[PDB]
Amino acid sequence: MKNVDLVIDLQFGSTGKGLIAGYLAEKNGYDTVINANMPNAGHTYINAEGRKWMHKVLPNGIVSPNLKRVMLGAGSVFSINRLMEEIEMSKDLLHDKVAILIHPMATVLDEEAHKKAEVGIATSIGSTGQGSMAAMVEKLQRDPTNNTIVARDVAQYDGRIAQYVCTVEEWDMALMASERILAEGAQGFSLSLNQEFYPYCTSRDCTPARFLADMGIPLPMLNKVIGTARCHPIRVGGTSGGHYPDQEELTWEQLGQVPELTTVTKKVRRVFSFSFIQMQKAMWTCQPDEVFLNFCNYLSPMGWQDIVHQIEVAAQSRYCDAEVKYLGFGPTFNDVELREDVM
Amino acid sequence: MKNVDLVIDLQFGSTGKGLIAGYLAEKNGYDTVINANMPNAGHTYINAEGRKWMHKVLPNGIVSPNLKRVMLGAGSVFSINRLMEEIEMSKDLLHDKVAILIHPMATVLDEEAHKKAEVGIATSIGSTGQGSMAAMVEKLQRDPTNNTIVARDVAQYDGRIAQYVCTVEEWDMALMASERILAEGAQGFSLSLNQEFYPYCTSRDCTPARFLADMGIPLPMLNKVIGTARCHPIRVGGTSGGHYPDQEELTWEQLGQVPELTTVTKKVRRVFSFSFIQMQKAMWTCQPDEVFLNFCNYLSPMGWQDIVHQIEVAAQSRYCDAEVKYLGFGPTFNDVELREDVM
Ligand SMILES: Nc1ncnc2c1ncn2[C@@H]1O[C@H](COP(=O)(O)OP(=O)(O)OP(=O)(O)O)[C@@H](O)[C@H]1O
Ligand SMILES: Nc1ncnc2c1ncn2[C@@H]1O[C@H](COP(=O)(O)OP(=O)(O)OP(=O)(O)O)[C@@H](O)[C@H]1O
Ligand SMILES: Nc1nc2c(ncn2[C@H]2C[C@H](O)[C@@H](COP(=O)(O)O)O2)c(=O)[nH]1
Ligand SMILES: Nc1nc2c(ncn2[C@H]2C[C@H](O)[C@@H](COP(=O)(O)O)O2)c(=O)[nH]1
Ligand SMILES: [Cl-]
Ligand SMILES: [Mg+2]
Ligand SMILES: [Mg+2]
């Protein structure tokens, strides 16, 4: 037990979870990396040598030097095409002594039907329109005649995932056999289905409890929660929802920064000032032990040092002993500073 | 912060959670009782005086002598009619100093549309066909024009719940302000969406992680998990799913018991021998601290004493220090024995 480090987002997503996941994977050498991603979530890790991993399926933690298991949780919604591609792109890391385990109930994304089902919400709620919820809904239908939604069933006619699809027992045994686990949450605290921005939110809760549930991680296994934040939280472009009372929407030109986009759609990310309210809210339910404060490169030292003190008191106020341990000044491994080294 | 006692079911549901919830509520005097029930779950508590509470919405813990808050989680799917009936039937317990808090994102069941949507699975997967998932799916749609699915929106035109529907802040504050919390899980571990019986399962995981997530309970708030089990696990009637390799389907006549009828459908419950495999599986992910072993009245002392030893070694085998603390010999408060007193 107590061997799971879970990376969660404290804001509305895209805080740099892919970066801290890959950074911690390299630093801590987890033998097991696990997630429960849906296609709405792209995760980028760039190592010291400049190698980039943009993952929608595989954990970014596959960069761990002691990698034995790659686990794709039951809450996973994935494109097999994308998975194939991602495995291929890191086949050097995903060697013969690395077991890729797809939970039998992980959802196979029907790229045509599921993205087409989310065209409406892609404009109405600014949804990534990636088919995440449409896939999830098809799975929830629990139609016995539907052999095309869960990994277990898809493995029977689509041999590409057949070797990866495990049983629920193998799943549990893989977690039991793991020495140190990196659990990678996706999306963001405030994007949680049950946070206050409904319906301008995602299809699930983006909370440690939900991410552990979606990866089938027993609660005693949780060792550490590394919450991630940006100095200026973002939202996706469009009518993607409101913000907290203590924050204002900013422009990329107001920040003196190049407009951040959603990589494929190129929608300009919405950017907001830091929200203390959001932080207390995220601190209260996410209860991180450690905090990665990213995009410190968008602020002056006084600015990001201030947000560090804000996060830690927002933590303390919500009975959370969160320590901003990591600071991000760029998208690569080299840009992750130990907070104690820079302040 | 550890003040939440979470009641979970270790088998396929109807193990007597309602009973242990009401029993522990009376014994421990929680000021806050919380759940995230869907209409597929009916929980029965009978006190020492013979008063019965068959709850589909309200926690059974409302019988707590120190009750201050009744909380209906965001994962809740409820009929307002049923909620009103249960409030009415317990209006003496739910006085002016008792705050009923319905999470703003708790789902309001559309009895006609949602039950109609689950007619197929009510026969195909033996689903309670109560509209649980159809309500959940409507909520997941996140259509901004849909003002009729979440409690927050429904409270705006349906005044019956208006006083109960809180904000996400009030929700968090109500949990923060609570001294001792009784979290009541529903359904059963093996009914979990991501357990091996898919699609013969429920619309979510019935795991502590999912239950805490669905009630918006921060993980550090978890004090203890009371797992519940029957000596002979049941399933609902019909084509409700398989069983474990170490268990066999029995008849009520084989057990010398009057045929038990499903909470929702008047259908005869399917009954199985005790499954050690099921227990290890439930012990592994549910990780109960305490176990309530119910329906001991269906076995001889040697029989239920054996299942006690089986549960505790199934626990130990899955790194779980679960202690069968409670034994059930009937449906009332008087029938809950301390295991140390009877063996
Ligand atoms: N400090 C930084 N400065 C500049 N760019 C950065 C920094 N940290 C990360 N990035 C980049 O900004 C984006 C952050 O999104 P990324 O997908 O890595 O985050 P995430 O938290 O994993 O997202 P998701 O919400 O999908 O879970 C990526 O394109 C990443 O390369
Ligand atoms: N030991 C017992 N002997 C006989 N009947 C009992 C016993 N314990 C509980 N019951 C009855 O068994 C039935 C099933 O229990 P109940 O509906 O409360 O289960 P539950 O575990 O709370 O439900 P669910 O699966 O919906 O979450 C009820 O009618 C209850 O009163
Ligand atoms: N930045 C970011 N936004 C996301 C992610 N997942 C969901 N969202 C946001 C986009 C919208 O504001 C809202 C609805 O999106 P979707 O879950 O794709 O239906 O949630 C994610 O991983 N990152
Ligand atoms: N005994 C019992 N069965 C349930 C409960 N919730 C769901 N189920 C079972 C009935 C079916 O076998 C299956 C699917 O049901 P449903 O969740 O109602 O769609 O799960 C519950 O609380 N108790
Ligand atoms: Cl107790
Ligand atoms: Mg991103
Ligand atoms: Mg029941």
Which residue in A14, A79, A190, A203 is the catalytic one?
A: A14
Q: Name the packing angle between helices B276-286 and A168-177 (round to 10°).
A: 50
Judge: A209–B205 Cβ closer than 8 Å, yes or no.
no
Judge: B144–A136 Cβ closer than 8 Å, yes or no.
no
Contact by Cβ (8 Å): B67, B100: no
Give the length of chain A.
343
Residue showing tokens 């005693």: A220
Q: Which residues in chain A are contacts of B146 at CB distance < 8 A?
A: 199
Residue A96: C-alpha distances to residues A26, A68, A84, A88 (Å): 20, 9, 16, 13
Distance CA B206, CA B107 (A): 18
Distance CA B77, CA B46 (A): 24
Residue showing tokens 């006690």: B308
Buried b (16+ CB within 10 A) or exposed e, B50-86: eeebebbbbbbbbbbeebbbbbbbbbbbbbbebbeeb
Distance CA B68, CA A26 (A): 48
Residue nearest atom 17 of ligand 1, based on CA coordinates: A43
Contact by Cβ (8 Å): B29, B65: yes
Whether the link from the prior residue into A199 is cis, omega within 30° of 0, is: yes
- What are the residues whose beta carbons fall under 8 Å from the beta carbon of B98, sequence distance 6 or more? B62, B67, B68, B69, B70
Specify which residues B234 forms β-bridges with.
B271
- Taking the CA of residue B162 and the nearest CA in chain A, the distance in Å comes to 17
B290: CATH: 3.40.440.10
Distance CA B240, CA B221 (A): 34
Q: Three-class SS of residue B10?
A: coil
Contact by Cβ (8 Å): B283, B312: no
List of E strands, B10-66: 32-35, 43-46, 52-55
∠A71-A72-A76 over CA atoms, to 5°?
A: 165
Distance CA B69, CA B131 (A): 27
Residue showing tokens 């991000």: A328
Domain carrying residue A272:
4-342
Distance CA A35, CA A208 (A): 12
Q: Which residues in chain A are contacts of B167 at CB distance < 8 A?
A: 196
Partner B contacted by A156 (CB < 8 A): no
A14 noted as active-site residue: yes
Q: Report B:225-254 residues touching A (Cβ under 8 A).
A: 225
Nearest ligand to residue B4 Cα: 5
Residue A266: C-alpha distances to residues A13, A236, A260, A263, B136 (Å): 16, 10, 9, 5, 31
Q: Strand A336-338 relative to strand A323-328: parallel, antiparallel, unpaired?
A: antiparallel
> Of ligand 2's atoms, which has the minimum distance to the CA of residue B52?
31
Q: Judge if the beta carbon of residue B41 lies within 6 A of ligand 4.
A: yes
Judge: A198–B152 Cβ closer than 8 Å, yes or no.
yes
Distance CA B251, CA B228 (A): 22
Distance CA B64, CA B73 (A): 18
Q: Judge if the beta carbon of residue A191 lies within 6 A of ligand 3.
A: yes
Give the length of chain B.
343
Residue showing tokens 């069983």: B243
Resolution in A, one decimal? 2.3
Q: Which amino acid belongs to residue B262? A: T
Nearest Cα to Cα of residue A203 among A191, A220, A185, A211: A191
Q: How far apart are the first and last CA of chain A?
A: 34
Nearest Cα to Cα of residue B80 among B185, B164, B146, B9: B164
List, in sequence order, the alpha helices (H) in chain A. Answer: 17-28, 80-89, 111-117, 119-124, 132-140, 151-154, 159-162, 168-177, 208-214, 276-286, 301-317, 339-342
Residue A125: C-alpha distances to residues A122, A202, B170 (Å): 6, 9, 25
How buried is residue A294: exposed, middle or buried, by Cβ count under 10 Å (0-12/13-18/19+)?
buried
Nearest Cα to Cα of residue A55 among A40, A75, A73, A74: A40
Judge: A209–B220 Cβ closer than 8 Å, yes or no.
no
DSSP string, A214-263: HTT--GGGEEEEEEEEESS-EE-SSS-----TT--EE-TTTTT-PPPB-T
Specify which residues B84 forms β-bridges with.
none
Residue of B10, B128, B130 to mutate, ligand 4, most atoms within 8 A of C-beta: B128
Q: Hey, what are A301's tokens?
A: 């030292």
Kind and range of the H or E run holding A87: helix A80-89
Distance CA B187, CA B37 (A): 9
Q: What is the three-state SS of B283-300?
A: HHHHCCCEEEEECHHHCC
Q: Hey, what are B91's tokens?
A: 């209006």
Q: Report B:274-303 residues touching A (Cβ under 8 A).
A: 281, 284-287
Q: How many domains does chain B have?
A: 1
Distance CA B177, CA B221 (A): 12
Q: Judge if the beta carbon of residue B40 lies within 6 A of ligand 4.
A: yes
Distance CA A61, CA A67 (A): 8
